[PDB]
CSV table of C-alpha atoms and ligand atoms in Angstrom, one decimal:
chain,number,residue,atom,x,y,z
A,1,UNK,CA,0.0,0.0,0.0
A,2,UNK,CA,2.6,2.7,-0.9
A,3,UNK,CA,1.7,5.6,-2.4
A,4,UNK,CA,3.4,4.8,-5.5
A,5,UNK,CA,1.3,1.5,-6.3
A,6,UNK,CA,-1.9,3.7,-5.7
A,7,UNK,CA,-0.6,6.4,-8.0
A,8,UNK,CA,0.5,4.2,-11.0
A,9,UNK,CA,-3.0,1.9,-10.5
A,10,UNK,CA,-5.2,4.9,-10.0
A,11,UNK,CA,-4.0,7.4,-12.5
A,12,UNK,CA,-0.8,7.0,-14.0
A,13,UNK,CA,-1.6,3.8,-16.4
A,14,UNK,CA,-5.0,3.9,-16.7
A,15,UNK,CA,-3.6,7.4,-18.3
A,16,UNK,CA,-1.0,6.1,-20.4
A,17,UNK,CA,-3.4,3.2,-21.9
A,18,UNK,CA,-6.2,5.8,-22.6
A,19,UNK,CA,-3.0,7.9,-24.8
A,20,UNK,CA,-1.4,4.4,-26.5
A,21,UNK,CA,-2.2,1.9,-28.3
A,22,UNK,CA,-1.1,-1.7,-26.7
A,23,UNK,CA,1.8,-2.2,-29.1
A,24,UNK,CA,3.2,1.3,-28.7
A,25,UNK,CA,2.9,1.1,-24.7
A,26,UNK,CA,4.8,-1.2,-24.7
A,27,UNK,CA,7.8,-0.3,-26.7
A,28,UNK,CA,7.6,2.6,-24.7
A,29,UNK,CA,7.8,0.2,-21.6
A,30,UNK,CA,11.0,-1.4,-22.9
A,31,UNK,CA,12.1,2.1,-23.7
A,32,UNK,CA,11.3,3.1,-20.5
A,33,UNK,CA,13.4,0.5,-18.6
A,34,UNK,CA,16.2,0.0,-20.7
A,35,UNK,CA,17.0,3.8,-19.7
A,36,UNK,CA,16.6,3.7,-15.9
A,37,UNK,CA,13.4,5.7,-15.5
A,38,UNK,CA,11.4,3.7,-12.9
A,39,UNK,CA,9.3,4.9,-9.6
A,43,UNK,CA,11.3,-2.7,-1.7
A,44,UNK,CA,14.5,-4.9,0.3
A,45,UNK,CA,15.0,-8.6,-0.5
A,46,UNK,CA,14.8,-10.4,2.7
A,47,UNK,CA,16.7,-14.3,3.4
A,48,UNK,CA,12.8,-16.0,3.5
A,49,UNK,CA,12.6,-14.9,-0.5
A,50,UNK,CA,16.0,-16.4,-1.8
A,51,UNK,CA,15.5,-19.6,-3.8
A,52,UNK,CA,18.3,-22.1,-4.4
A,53,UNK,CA,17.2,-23.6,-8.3
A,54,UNK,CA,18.2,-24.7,-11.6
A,55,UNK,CA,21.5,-24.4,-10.0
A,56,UNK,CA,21.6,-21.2,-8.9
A,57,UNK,CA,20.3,-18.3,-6.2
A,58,UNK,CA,17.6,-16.8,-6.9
A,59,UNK,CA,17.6,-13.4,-4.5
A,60,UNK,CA,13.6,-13.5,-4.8
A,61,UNK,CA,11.4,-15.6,-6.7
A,62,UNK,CA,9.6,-13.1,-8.7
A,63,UNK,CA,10.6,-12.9,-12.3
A,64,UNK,CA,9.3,-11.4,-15.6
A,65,UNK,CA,8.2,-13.3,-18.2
A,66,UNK,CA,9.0,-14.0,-21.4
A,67,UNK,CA,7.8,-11.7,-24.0
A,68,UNK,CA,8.2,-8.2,-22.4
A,69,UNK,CA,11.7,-7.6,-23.3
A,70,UNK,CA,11.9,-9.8,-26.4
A,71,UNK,CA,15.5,-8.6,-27.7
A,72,UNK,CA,17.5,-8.4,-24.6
A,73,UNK,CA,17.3,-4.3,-24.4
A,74,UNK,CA,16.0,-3.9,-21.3
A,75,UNK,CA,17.5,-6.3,-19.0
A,76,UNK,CA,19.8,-4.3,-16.5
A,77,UNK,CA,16.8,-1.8,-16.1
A,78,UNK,CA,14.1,-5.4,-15.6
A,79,UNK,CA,16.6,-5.6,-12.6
A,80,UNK,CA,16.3,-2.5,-10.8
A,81,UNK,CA,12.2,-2.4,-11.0
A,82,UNK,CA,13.2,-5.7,-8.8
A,83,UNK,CA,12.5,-9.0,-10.4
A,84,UNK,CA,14.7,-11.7,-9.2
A,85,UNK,CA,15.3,-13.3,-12.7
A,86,UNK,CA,15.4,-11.8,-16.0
A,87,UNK,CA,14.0,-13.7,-19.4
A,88,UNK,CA,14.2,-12.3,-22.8
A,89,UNK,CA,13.1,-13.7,-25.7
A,90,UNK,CA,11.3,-15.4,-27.8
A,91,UNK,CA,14.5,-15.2,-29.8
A,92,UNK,CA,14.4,-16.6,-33.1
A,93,UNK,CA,17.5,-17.6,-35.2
A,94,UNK,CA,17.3,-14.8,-38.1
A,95,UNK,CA,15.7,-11.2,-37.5
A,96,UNK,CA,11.5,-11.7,-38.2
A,97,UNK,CA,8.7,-9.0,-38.1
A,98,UNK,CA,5.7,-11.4,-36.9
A,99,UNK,CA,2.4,-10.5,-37.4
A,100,UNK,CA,1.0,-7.4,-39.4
A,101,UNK,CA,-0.6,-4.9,-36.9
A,102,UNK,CA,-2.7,-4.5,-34.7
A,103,UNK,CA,-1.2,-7.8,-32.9
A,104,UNK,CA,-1.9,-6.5,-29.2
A,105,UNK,CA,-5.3,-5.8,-27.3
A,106,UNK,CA,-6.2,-4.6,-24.0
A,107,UNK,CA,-9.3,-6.8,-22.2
A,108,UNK,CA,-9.6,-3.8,-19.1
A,109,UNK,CA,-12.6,-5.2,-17.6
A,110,UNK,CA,-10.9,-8.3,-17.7
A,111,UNK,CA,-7.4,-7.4,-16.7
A,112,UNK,CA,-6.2,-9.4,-19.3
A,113,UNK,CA,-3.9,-8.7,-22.9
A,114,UNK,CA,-4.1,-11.0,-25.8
A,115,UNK,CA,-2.0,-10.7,-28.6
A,116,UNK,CA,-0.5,-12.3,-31.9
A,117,UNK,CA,3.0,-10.3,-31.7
A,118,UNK,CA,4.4,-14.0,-33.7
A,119,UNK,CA,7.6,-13.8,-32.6
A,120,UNK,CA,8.4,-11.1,-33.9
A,121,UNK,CA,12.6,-10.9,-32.9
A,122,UNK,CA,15.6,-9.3,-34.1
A,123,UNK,CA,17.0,-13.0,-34.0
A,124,UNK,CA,20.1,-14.5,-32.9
A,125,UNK,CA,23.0,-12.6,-33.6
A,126,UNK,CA,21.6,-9.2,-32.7
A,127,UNK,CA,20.6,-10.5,-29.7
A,128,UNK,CA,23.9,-12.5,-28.9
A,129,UNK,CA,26.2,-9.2,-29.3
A,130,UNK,CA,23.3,-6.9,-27.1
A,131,UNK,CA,24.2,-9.9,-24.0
A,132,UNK,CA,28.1,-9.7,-24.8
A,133,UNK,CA,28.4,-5.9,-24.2
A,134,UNK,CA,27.2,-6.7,-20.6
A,135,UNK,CA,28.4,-10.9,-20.4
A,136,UNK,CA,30.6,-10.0,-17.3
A,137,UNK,CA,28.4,-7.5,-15.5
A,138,UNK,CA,25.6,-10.7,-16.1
A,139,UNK,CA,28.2,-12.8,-14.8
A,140,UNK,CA,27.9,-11.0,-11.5
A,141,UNK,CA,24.2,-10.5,-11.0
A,142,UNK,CA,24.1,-14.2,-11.5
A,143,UNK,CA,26.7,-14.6,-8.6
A,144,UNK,CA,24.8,-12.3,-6.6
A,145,UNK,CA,21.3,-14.1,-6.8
A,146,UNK,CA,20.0,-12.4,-9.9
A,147,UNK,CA,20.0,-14.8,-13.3
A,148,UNK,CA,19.7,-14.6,-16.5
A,149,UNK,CA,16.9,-16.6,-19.1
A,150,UNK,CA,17.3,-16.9,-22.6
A,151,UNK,CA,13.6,-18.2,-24.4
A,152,UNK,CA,14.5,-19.9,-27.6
A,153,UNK,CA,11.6,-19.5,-30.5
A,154,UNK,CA,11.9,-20.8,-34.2
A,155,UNK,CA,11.4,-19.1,-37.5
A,156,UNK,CA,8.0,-18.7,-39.4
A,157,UNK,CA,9.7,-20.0,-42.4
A,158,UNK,CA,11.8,-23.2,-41.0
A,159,UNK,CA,11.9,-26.4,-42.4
A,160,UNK,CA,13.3,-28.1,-39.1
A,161,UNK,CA,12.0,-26.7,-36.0
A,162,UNK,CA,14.4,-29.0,-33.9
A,163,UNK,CA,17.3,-27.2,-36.2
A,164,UNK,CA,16.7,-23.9,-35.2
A,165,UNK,CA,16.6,-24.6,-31.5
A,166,UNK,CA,19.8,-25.7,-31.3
A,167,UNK,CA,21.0,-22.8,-33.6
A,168,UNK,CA,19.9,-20.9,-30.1
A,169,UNK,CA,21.8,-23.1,-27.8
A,170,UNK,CA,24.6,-23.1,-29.9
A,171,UNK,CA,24.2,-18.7,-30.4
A,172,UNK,CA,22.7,-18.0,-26.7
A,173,UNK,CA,23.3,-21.0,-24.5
A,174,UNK,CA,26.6,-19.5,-23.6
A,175,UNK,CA,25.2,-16.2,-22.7
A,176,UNK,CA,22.4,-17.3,-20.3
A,177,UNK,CA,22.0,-19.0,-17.0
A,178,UNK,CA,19.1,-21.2,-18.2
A,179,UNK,CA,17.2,-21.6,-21.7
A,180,UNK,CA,13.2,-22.0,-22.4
A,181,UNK,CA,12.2,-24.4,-25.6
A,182,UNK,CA,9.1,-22.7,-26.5
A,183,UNK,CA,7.4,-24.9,-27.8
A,184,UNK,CA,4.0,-23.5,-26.9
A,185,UNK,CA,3.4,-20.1,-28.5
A,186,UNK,CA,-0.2,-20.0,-30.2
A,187,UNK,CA,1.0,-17.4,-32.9
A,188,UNK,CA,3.2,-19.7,-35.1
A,189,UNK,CA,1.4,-22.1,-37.2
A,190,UNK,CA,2.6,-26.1,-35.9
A,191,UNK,CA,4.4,-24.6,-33.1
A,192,UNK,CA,2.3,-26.2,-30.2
A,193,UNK,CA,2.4,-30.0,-32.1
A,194,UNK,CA,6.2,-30.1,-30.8
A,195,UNK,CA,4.6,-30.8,-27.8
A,196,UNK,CA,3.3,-34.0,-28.6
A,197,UNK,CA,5.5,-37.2,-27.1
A,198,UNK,CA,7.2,-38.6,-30.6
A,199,UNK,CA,8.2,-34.9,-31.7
A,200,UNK,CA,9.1,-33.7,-28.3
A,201,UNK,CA,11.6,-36.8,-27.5
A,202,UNK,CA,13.3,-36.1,-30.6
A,203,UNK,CA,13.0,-32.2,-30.3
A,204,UNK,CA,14.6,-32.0,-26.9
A,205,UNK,CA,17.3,-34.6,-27.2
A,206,UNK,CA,19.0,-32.5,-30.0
A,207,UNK,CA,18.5,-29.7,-28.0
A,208,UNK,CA,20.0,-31.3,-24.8
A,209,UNK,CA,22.8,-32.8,-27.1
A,210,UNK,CA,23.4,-29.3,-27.9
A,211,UNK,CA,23.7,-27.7,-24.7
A,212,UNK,CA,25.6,-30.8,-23.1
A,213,UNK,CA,28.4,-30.0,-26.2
A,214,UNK,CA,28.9,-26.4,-24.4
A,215,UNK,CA,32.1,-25.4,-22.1
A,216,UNK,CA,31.3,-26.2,-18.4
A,217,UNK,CA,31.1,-22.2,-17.2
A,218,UNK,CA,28.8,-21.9,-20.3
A,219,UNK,CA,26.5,-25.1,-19.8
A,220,UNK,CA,22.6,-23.5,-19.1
A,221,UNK,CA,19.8,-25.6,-17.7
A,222,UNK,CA,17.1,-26.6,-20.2
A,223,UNK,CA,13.5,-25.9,-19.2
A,224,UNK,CA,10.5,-26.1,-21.5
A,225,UNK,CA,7.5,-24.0,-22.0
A,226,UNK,CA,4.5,-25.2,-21.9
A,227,UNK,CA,1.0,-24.3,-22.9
A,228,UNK,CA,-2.1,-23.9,-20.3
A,229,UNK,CA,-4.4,-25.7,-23.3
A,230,UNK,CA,-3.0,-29.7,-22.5
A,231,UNK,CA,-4.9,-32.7,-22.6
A,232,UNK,CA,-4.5,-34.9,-19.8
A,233,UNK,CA,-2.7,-37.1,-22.5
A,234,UNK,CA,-0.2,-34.3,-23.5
A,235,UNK,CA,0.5,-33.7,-19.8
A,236,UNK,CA,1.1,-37.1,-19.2
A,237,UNK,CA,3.2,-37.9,-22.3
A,238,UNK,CA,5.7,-34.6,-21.5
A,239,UNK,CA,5.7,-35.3,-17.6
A,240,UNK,CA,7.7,-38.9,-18.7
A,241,UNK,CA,9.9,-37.3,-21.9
A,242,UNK,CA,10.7,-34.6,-18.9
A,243,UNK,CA,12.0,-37.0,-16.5
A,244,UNK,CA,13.2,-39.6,-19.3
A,245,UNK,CA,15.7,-36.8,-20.8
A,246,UNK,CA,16.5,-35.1,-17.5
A,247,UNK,CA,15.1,-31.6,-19.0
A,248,UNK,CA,15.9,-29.4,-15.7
A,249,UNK,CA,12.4,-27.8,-15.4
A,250,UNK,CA,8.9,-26.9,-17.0
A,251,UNK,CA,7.3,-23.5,-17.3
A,252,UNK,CA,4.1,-23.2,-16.8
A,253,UNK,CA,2.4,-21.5,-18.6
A,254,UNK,CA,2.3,-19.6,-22.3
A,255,UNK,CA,-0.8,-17.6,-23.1
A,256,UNK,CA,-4.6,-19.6,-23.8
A,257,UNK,CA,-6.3,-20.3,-26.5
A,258,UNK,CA,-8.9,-20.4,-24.6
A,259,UNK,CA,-11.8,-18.1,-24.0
A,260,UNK,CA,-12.8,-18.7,-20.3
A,261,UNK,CA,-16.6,-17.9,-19.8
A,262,UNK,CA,-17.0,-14.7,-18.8
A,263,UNK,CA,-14.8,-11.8,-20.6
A,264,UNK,CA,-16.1,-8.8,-20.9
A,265,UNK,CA,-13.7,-6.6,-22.8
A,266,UNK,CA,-14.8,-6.0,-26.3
A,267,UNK,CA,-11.7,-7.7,-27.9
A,268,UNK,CA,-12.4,-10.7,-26.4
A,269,UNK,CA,-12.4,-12.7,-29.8
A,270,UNK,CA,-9.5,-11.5,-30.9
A,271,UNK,CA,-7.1,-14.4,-32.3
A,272,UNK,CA,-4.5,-14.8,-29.9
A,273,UNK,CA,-2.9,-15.5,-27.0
A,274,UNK,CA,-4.9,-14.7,-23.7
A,275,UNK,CA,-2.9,-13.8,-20.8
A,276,UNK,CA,-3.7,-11.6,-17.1
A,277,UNK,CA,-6.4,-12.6,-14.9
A,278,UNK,CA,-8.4,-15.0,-17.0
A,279,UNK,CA,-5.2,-17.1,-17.2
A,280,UNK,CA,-4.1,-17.3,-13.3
A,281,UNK,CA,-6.0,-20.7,-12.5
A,282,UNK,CA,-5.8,-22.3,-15.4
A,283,UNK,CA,-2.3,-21.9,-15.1
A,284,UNK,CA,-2.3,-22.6,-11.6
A,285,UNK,CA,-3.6,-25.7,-12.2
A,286,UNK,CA,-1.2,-26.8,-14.2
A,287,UNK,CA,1.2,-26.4,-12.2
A,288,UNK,CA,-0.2,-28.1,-9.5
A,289,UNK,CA,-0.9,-31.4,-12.6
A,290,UNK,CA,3.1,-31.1,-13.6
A,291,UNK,CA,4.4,-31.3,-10.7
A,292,UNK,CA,2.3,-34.1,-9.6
A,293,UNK,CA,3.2,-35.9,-12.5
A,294,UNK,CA,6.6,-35.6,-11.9
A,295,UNK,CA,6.7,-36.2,-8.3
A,296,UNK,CA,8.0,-32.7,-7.3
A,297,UNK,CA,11.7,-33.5,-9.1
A,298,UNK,CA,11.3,-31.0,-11.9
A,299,UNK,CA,11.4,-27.3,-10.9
A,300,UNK,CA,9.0,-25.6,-12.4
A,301,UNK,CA,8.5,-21.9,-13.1
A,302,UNK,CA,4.7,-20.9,-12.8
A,303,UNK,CA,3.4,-17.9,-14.7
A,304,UNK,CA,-0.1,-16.7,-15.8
A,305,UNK,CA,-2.3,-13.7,-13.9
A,306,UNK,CA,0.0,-12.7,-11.1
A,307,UNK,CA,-0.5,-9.6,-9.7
A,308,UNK,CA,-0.7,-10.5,-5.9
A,309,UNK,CA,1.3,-12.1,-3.2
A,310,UNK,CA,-1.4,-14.3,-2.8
A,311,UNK,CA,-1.5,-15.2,-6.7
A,312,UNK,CA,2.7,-16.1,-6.5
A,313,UNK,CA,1.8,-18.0,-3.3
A,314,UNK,CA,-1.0,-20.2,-4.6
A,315,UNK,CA,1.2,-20.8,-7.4
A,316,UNK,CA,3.9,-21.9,-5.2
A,317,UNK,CA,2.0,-23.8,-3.0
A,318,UNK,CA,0.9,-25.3,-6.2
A,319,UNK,CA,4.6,-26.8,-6.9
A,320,UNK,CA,6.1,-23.5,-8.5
A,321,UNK,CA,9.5,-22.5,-7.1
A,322,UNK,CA,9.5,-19.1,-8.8
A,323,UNK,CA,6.9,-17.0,-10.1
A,324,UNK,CA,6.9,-14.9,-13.7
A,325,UNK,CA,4.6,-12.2,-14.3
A,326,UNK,CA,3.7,-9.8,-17.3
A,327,UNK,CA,0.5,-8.6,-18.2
A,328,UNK,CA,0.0,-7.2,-14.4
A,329,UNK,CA,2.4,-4.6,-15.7
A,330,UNK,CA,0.1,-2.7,-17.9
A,331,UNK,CA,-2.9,-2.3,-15.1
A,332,UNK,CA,0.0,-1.7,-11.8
A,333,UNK,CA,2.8,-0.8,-13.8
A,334,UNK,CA,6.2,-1.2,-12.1
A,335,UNK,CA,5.3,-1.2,-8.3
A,336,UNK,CA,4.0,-4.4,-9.0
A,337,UNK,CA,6.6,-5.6,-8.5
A,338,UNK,CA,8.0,-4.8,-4.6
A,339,UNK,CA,4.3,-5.3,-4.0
A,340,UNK,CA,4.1,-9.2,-4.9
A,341,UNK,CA,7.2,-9.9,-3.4
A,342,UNK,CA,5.6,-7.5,0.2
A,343,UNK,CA,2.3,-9.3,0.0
A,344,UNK,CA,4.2,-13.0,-0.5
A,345,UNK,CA,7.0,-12.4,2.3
A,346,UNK,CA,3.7,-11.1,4.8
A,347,UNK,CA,1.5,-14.1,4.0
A,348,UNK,CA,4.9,-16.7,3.6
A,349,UNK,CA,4.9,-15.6,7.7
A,350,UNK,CA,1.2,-15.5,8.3
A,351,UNK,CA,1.1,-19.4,7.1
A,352,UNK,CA,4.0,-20.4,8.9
A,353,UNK,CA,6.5,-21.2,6.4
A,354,UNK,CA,10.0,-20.5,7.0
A,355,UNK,CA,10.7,-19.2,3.4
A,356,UNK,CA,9.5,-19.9,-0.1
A,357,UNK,CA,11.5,-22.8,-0.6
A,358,UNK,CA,9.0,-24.1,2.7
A,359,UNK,CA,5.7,-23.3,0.7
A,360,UNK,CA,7.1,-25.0,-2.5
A,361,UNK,CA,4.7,-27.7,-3.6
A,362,UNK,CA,3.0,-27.5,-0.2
A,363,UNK,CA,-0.5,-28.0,-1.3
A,364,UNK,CA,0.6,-31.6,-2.2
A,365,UNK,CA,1.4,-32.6,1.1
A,366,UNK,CA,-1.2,-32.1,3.4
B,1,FMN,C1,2.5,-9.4,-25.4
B,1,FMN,C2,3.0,-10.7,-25.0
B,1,FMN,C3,4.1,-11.3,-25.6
B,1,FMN,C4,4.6,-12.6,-25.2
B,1,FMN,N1,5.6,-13.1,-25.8
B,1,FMN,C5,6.1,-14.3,-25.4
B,1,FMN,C6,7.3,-14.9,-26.0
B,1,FMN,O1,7.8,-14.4,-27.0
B,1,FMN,N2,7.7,-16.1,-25.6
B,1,FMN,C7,7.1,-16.8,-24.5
B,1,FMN,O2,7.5,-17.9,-24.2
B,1,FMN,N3,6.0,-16.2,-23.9
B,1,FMN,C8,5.5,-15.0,-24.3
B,1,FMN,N4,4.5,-14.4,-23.7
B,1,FMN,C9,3.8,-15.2,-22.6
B,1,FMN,C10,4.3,-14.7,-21.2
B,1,FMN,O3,5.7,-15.0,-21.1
B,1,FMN,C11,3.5,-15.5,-20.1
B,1,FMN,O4,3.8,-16.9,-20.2
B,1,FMN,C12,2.0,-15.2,-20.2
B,1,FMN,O5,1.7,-13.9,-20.7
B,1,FMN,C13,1.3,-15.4,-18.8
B,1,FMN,O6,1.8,-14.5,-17.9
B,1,FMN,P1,1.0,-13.2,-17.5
B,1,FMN,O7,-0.4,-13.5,-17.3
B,1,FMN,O8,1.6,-12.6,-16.2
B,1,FMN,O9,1.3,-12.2,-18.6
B,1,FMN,C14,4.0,-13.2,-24.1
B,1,FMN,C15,2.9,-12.6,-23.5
B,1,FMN,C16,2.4,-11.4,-23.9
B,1,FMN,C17,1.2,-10.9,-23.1
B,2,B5X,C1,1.8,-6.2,-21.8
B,2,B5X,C2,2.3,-5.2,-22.9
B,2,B5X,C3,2.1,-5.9,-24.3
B,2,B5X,C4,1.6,-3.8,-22.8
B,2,B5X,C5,0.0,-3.9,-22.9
B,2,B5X,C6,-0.7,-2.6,-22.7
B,2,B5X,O1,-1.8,-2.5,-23.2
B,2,B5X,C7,0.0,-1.6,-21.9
B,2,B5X,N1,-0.5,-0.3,-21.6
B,2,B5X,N2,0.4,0.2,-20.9
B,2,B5X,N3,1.5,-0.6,-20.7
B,2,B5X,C8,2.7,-0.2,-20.0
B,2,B5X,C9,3.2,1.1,-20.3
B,2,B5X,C10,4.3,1.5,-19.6
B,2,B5X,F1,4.7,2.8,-19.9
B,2,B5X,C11,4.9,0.8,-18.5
B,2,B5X,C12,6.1,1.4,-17.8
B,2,B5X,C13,7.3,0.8,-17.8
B,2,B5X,C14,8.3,1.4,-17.1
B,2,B5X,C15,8.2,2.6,-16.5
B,2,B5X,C16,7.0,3.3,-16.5
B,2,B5X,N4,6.8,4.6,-15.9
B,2,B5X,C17,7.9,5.4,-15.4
B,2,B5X,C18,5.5,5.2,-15.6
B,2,B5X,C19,5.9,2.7,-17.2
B,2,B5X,C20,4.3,-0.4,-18.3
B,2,B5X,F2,4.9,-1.2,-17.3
B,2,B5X,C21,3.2,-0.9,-19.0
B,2,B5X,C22,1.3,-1.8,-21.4
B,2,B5X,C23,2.0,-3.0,-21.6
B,3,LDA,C1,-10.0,-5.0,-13.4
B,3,LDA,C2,-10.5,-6.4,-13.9
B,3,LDA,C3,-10.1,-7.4,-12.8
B,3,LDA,C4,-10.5,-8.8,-13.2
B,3,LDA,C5,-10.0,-9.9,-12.1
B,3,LDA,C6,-10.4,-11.3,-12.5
B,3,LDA,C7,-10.4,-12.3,-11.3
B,3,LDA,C8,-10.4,-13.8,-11.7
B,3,LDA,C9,-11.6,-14.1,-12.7
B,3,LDA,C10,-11.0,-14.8,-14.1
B,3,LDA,C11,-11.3,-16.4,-14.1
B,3,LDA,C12,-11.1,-17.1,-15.5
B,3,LDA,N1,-11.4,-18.7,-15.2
B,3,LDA,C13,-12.8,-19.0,-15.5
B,3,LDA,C14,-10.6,-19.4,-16.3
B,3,LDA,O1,-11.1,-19.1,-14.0
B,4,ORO,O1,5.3,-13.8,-30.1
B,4,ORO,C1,4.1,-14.0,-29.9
B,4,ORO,O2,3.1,-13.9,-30.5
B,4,ORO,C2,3.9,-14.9,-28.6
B,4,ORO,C3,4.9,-16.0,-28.3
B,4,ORO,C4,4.6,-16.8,-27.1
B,4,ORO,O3,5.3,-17.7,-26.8
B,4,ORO,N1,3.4,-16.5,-26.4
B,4,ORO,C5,2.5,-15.5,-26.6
B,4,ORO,O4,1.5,-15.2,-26.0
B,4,ORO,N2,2.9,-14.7,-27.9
């Protein structure tokens, strides 16, 4: 309850998204950040020990924010724990002709159909060398570095052009995402089926395994909130058959739960914000049942509260992402997620996140 997050929820955004269209808020977002022009201390109870690494709190952004590595050093100081850029895909691409980004207000939810839109591989790899030592010691001191792998509208061979990301970016980042569940490129979510992903993620594992030891990221995979119980099932066992080092969960819906209101609620697209949170939620709580806890996951989809990173990690997450809270609380969401977890962490009694992780399963 500072006076910032009243200010920014109250009047500041509701401002800026009554003066911008979604697309051009948020390169002014990015733009934003990447210079330093933002409006919380990390306590012991918040650090996470994952994916091997510290993780100084477990509140991250997601994925799709800062898609071409611009912005990361200023993603830091608004306070995220962990930094993921990306989707990168392996030659520049301008996705989707515009308008590709909607605001749902009375929803609290985004969709879009950006389609991975990227400046590609070896833009991206040169932005993360100007700063590969000053990365090297955020990591050290609890604050890492993601690097979400996409693949060309155009590719012949999708498994191709994720290793062409291990190979460009695996060196550069502390862990990696196979997307593989996007709804904006056309086959992209069939990767996920058992047969393709096997094959898929062995390359890629081959790949990163074939990388110098101080260079050698974890592996995780993205996956989509719009599973059968059969898709879960069959990438729960390719998971724990391959040894992939941990599941995000989740991408943006297909869906359209029952309910929205906003006007561009049947906009094609991926839905993310409020809509998403339990949905996503309970996927978590399936993956990590399915995999008996082993695999760390990352959960993501309509977190704006402590209580929404908390149910999450109760749920089996051991960190949180969140995006689309940004456009509604703008950057105090931030210190205010990781205020409301650390106060409710103590009101149930758990000595720290790493306590509360999966803690809904054992009761
Ligand atoms: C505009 C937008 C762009 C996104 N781009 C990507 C992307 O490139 N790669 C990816 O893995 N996820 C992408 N996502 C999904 C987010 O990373 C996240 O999984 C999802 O939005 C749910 O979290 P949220 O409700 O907090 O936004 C994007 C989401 C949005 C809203
Ligand atoms: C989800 C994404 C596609 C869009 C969707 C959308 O419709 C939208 N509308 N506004 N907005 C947005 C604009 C912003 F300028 C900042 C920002 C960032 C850093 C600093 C500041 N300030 C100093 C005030 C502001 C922000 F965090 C979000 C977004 C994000
Ligand atoms: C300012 C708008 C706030 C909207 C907050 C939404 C709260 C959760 C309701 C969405 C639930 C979607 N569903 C059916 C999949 O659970
Ligand atoms: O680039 C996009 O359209 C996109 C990629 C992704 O993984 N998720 C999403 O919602 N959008």
């Amino acid at each position: 309850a500072t006076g910032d997050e009243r200010f920014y929820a109250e009047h500041l955004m509701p401002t800026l998204q009554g003066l911008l269209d979604p697309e051009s808020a948020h390169r002014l977002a990015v733009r934003f950040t990447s210079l330093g022009l933002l409006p919380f201390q990390d306590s012991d109870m918040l650090e996470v020990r994952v994916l091997g690494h510290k993780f100084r709190n477990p509140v991250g952004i997601a994925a799709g924010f800062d898609k071409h590595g611009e912005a990361v050093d200023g993603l830091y100081k608004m306070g995220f724990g962990f930094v993921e850029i990306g989707s990168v895909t392996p030659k520049p691409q301008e996705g989707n002709p515009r308008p590709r980004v909607f605001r749902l207000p009375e929803d609290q939810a985004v969709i879009n159909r950006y389609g991975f839109n990227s400046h590609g591989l070896s833009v991206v790899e040169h932005r993360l060398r100007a700063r590969q030592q000053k990365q090297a010691k955020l990591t050290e001191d609890g604050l890492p570095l993601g690097v979400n792998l996409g693949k060309n509208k155009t590719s012949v061979d999708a498994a191709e052009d994720y290793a062409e990301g291990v190979r460009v970016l695996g060196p550069l980042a502390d862990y990696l995402v196979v997307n593989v569940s996007s709804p904006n490129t056309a086959g992209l979510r069939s990767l996920q089926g058992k047969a393709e992903l096997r094959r898929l993620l062995t390359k890629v594992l081959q790949e990163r395994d074939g990388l110098r030891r101080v260079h050698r990221p974890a592996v995780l995979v993205k996956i989509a909130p719009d599973l059968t119980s059969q898709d879960k099932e069959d990438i729960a066992s390719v998971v724990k058959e391959l040894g992939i080092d941990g599941l995000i969960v989740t991408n943006t819906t297909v869906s359209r739960p029952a309910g929205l209101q906003g006007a561009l609620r049947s906009e094609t697209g991926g839905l993310s914000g409020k809509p998403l949170r339990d949905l996503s939620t309970q996927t978590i709580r399936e993956m990590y049942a399915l995999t008996q806890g082993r695999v760390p996951i990352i959960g993501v989809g309509g977190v704006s509260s402590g209580q929404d990173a908390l149910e999450k990690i109760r749920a089996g997450a051991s960190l949180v992402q969140l995006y689309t809270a940004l456009t509604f609380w703008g950057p105090p969401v931030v210190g205010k997620v990781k205020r409301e977890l650390e106060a409710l962490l103590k009101e149930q009694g758990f000595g720290g996140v790493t306590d509360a992780i999966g803690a809904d399963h054992r009761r």
